[PDB]
């Protein structure tokens, strides 16, 4: 505390503060599928955790293989 902000809220309750839903998730807990995150890490632009965009889909031409044999 003395660093509180947004993104601190979990997504269900995140739906609840915005009053998209009159009913708190308490009464109606959500699907809880296997691949969804649990701790909820909130926004992290600074600090060592930090999104990095990068090249995707490997390679192109595959440059020709040099001979290893002398002569």
């Amino acid at each position: 505390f003395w660093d509180v902000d947004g993104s601190m809220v979990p997504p269900e309750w995140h739906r609840w503060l915005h009053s998209m839903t009159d009913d708190p998730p308490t009464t109606k807990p959500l699907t809880a599928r296997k691949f969804i995150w649990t701790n909820h890490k909130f926004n992290v632009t600074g600090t060592p955790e930090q999104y990095v965009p990068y090249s995707t889909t490997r390679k192109k031409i595959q440059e020709w293989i040099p001979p290893s044999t002398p002569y």
Partner: peptide, 16 residues
């Protein structure tokens, strides 16, 4: 898309 003469490749003193 397969292997290509991408860079010049001069033989050295080793003949490589």
């Amino acid at each position: 898309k397969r292997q290509r003469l991408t860079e010049p490749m001069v033989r050295n003193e080793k003949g490589l």
